[PDB]
């Protein structure tokens, strides 16, 4: 078995600006993280990783 991980950063000014203008940024960053995780799983299934055997 193996494990995955990633993260992102955000600031108070950006949070307030998103809440004011109607479009946030944390939602987009979380969507990007989830999509990256899913593509990593698919790439692991179909292409493997020689150093990880």
Going by C-beta distance under 8 Å and a sequence separation of 6 or more, which residues neighbour residue 25? 10, 14, 15, 18
CB of 30 to other proteins, least distance (A): 14
Contact, 2 vs 52, CB < 8 A? yes
Binding mask 1-40 vs other proteins (x if CB under 8 A, - otherwise)? -xx---x-x-x-xx-xx--xx---x------x--xx--x-
8-11-12 Cα angle (round to 5): 145
Rule CB under 8 A: which residues touch other proteins?
A: 2-3, 7, 9, 11, 13-14, 16-17, 20-21, 25, 32, 35-36, 39, 42-43, 49-53
């Amino acid at each position: 078995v193996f494990r995955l991980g990633n993260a992102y950063l955000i600031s108070i000014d950006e949070i307030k600006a998103g809440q004011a203008t109607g479009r946030p940024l944390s939602t987009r960053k979380a969507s990007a993280c989830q999509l990256a995780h899913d593509q990593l799983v698919n790439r692991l299934v179909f292409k493997g990783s020689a150093p990880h055997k």
